[PDB]
Design a protein around this ligand. Structure first.
Ligand SMILES: Cc1ccc([C@H](C)Nc2ccc3c(c2)N(C2CC2)[C@H](C)C(=O)N3C)cc1
Length: 124
């Protein structure tokens, strides 16, 4: 019941390694990765393990930090804005599928606060 995960490698994609993208991996993602609440978001939602066959009926553009990490490590992105959009997709998916006050939403909200603080200032 799980869809194939989002692509992390694509040679036809134009790739770039900007200072901002290096920082998004070295600083932003690796800070969030060690957060006490990161673990649900370190890999795609496994709807089979969670017994949530409804998850991928609702969420049609899944995203997670494990995919984001592999993309950054594959220099998959052209600019930091594309990577930030992936983070935002991951958070928005969680708020769409769940309801305010749910434990998973509190974890996402905490990660997002940290995320917004870390990207408030990026390199030039
Ligand atoms: C507080 C708590 C409760 C359950 C789990 C289970 C083990 N793993 C898990 C990983 C990712 C997600 C979810 C569960 N949930 C909901 C099920 C709670 C939905 C699908 C969601 O949107 N995401 C991003 C972890 C943390």
């Amino acid at each position: 019941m799980n869809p194939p995960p989002p692509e992390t490698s694509n040679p036809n994609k134009p790739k770039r390694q900007t200072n901002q993208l290096q920082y998004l991996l070295r600083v932003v993602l690796k800070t969030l990765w060690k957060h006490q609440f990161a673990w649900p978001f370190q890999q795609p939602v496994d709807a089979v393990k969670l017994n949530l066959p409804d998850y991928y009926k609702i969420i049609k553009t899944p995203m997670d930090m494990g995919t984001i990490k592999k993309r950054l490590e594959n220099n998959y992105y052209w600019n930091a804005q594309e990577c930030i959009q992936d983070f935002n997709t991951m958070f928005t998916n969680c708020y769409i599928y769940n309801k305010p006050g749910d434990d998973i939403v509190l974890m996402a909200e905490a990660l997002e606060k940290l995320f917004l603080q870390k990207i408030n200032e990026l390199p030039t």
